[PDB]
Short mmCIF file of the C-alpha atoms (twelve columns), coordinates in Angstrom:
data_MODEL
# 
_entry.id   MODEL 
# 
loop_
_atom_site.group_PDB 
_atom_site.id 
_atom_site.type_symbol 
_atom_site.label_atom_id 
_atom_site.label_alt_id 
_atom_site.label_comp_id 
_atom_site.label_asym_id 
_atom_site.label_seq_id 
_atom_site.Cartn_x 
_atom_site.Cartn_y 
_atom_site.Cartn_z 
_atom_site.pdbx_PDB_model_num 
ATOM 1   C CA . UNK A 1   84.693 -150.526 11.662  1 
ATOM 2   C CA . UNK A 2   81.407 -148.885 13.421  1 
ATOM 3   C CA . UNK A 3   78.024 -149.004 11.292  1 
ATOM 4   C CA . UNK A 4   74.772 -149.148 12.957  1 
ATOM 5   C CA . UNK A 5   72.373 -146.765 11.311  1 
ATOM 6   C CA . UNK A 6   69.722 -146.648 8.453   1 
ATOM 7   C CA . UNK A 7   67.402 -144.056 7.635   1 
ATOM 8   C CA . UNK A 8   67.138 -141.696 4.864   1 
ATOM 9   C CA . UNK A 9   68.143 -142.906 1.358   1 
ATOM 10  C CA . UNK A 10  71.902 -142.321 -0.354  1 
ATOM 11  C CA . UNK A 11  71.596 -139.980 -3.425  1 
ATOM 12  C CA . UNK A 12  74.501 -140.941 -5.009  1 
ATOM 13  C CA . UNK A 13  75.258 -138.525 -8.056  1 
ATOM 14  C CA . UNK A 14  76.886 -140.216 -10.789 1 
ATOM 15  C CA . UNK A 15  79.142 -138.987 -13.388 1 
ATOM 16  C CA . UNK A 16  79.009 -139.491 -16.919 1 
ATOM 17  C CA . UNK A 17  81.942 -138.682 -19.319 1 
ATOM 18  C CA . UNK A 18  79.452 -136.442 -21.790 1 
ATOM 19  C CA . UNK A 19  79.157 -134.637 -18.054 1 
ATOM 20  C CA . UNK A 20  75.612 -134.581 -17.179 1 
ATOM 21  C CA . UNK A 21  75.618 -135.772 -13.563 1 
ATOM 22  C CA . UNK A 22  72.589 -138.873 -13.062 1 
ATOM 23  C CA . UNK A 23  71.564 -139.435 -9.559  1 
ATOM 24  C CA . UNK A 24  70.105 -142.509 -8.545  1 
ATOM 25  C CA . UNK A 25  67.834 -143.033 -5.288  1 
ATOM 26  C CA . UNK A 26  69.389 -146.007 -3.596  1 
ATOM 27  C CA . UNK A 27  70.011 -146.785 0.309   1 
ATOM 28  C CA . UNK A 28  72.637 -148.975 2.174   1 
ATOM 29  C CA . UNK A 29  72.971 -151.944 -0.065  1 
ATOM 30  C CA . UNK A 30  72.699 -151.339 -4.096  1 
ATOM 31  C CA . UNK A 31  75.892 -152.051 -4.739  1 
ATOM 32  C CA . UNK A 32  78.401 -150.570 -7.710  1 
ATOM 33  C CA . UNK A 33  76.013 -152.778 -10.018 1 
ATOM 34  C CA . UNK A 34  72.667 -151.768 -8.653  1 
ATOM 35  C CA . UNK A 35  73.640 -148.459 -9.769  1 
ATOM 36  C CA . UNK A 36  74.746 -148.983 -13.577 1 
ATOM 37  C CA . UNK A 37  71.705 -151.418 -13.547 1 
ATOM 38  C CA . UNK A 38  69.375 -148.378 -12.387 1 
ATOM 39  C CA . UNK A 39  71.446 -145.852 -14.866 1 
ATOM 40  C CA . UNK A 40  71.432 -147.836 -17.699 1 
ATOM 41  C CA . UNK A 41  67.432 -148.442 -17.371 1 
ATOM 42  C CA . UNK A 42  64.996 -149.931 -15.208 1 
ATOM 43  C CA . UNK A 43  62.008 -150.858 -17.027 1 
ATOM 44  C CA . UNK A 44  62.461 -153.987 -19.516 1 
ATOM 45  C CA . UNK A 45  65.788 -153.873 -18.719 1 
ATOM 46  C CA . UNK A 46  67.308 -156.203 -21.468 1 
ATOM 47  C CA . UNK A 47  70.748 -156.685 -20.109 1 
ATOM 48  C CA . UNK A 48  73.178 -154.540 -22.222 1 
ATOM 49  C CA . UNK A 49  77.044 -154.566 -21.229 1 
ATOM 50  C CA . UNK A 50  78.331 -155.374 -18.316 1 
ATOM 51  C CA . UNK A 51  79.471 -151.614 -17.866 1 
ATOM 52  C CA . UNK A 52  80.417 -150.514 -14.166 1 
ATOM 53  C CA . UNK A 53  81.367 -147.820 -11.619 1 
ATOM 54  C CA . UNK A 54  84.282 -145.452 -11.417 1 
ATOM 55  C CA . UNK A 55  85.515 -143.613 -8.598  1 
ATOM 56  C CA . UNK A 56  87.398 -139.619 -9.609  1 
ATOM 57  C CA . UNK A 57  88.777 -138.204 -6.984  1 
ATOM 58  C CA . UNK A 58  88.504 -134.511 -8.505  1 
ATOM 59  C CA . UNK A 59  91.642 -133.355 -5.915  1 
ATOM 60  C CA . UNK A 60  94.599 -136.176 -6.676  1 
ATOM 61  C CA . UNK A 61  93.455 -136.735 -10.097 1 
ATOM 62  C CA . UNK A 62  93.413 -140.382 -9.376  1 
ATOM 63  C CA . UNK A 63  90.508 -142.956 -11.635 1 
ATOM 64  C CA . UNK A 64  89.883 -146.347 -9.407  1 
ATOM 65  C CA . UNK A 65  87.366 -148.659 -11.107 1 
ATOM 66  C CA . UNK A 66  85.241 -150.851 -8.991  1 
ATOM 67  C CA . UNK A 67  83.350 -154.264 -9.497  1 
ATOM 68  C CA . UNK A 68  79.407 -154.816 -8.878  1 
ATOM 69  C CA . UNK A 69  79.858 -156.182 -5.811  1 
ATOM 70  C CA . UNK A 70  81.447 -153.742 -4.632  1 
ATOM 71  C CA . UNK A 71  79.116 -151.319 -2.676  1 
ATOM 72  C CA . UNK A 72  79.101 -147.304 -4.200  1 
ATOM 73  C CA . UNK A 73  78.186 -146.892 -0.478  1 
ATOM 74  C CA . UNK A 74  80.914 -149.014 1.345   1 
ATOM 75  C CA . UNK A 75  83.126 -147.430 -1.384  1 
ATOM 76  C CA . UNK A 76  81.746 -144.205 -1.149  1 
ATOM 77  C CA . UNK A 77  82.666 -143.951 2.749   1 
ATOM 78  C CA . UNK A 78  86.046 -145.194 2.491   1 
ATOM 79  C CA . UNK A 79  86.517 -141.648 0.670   1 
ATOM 80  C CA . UNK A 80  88.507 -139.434 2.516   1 
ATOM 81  C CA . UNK A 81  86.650 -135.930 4.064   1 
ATOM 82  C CA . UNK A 82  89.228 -134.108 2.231   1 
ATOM 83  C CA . UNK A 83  88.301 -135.015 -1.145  1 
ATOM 84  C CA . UNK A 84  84.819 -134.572 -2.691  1 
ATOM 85  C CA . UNK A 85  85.312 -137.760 -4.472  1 
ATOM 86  C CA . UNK A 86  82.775 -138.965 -6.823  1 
ATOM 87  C CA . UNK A 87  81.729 -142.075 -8.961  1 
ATOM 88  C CA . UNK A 88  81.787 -142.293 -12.594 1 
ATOM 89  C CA . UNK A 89  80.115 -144.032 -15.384 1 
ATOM 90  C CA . UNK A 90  82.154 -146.145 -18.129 1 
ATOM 91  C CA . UNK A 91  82.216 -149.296 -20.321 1 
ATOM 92  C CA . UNK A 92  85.789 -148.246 -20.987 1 
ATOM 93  C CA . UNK A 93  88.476 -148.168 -18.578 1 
ATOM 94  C CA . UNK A 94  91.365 -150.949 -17.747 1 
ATOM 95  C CA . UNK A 95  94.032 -152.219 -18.551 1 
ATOM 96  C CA . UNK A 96  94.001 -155.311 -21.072 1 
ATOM 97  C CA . UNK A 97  91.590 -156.781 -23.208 1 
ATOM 98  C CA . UNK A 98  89.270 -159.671 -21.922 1 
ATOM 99  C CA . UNK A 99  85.985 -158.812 -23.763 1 
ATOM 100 C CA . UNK A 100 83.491 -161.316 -21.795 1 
# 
């Protein structure tokens, strides 16, 4: 509970299951969404799936999925030092159908 700083931008490198890694040049606010928004596209920009963010933790093997509010950044600190953790791209990945 200590953040009081903004400077340089957060390159956050996303994941995508194919495996070529998309970074994204956000700072301290795009949240989960901002980045599938900016993935997906930017220009025009119709609206496509709702789609999200995934955070691998390439150590413990563990797949957490996270909502659009939820800040990559926020997210992305909570990560642990030991673990080069890393966010992931998919339309796919619950448990239970809803289709919305």
């Amino acid at each position: 509970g200590s953040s009081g700083s903004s400077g340089r931008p957060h390159v956050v490198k996303v994941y995508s299951e194919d495996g070529a890694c998309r970074s994204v040049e956000v700072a301290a606010g795009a949240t989960a969404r901002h980045v599938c928004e900016m993935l997906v596209q930017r220009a025009h920009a119709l609206s496509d799936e709702t789609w999200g963010l995934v955070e691998c933790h390439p150590h413990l093997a563990l797949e957490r999925g996270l909502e659009d509010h939820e800040s990559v950044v926020e997210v992305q600190a909570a990560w642990p030092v030991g673990g080069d953790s890393r966010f992931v791209f998919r339309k796919n990945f619950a448990s239970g159908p809803s289709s919305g």
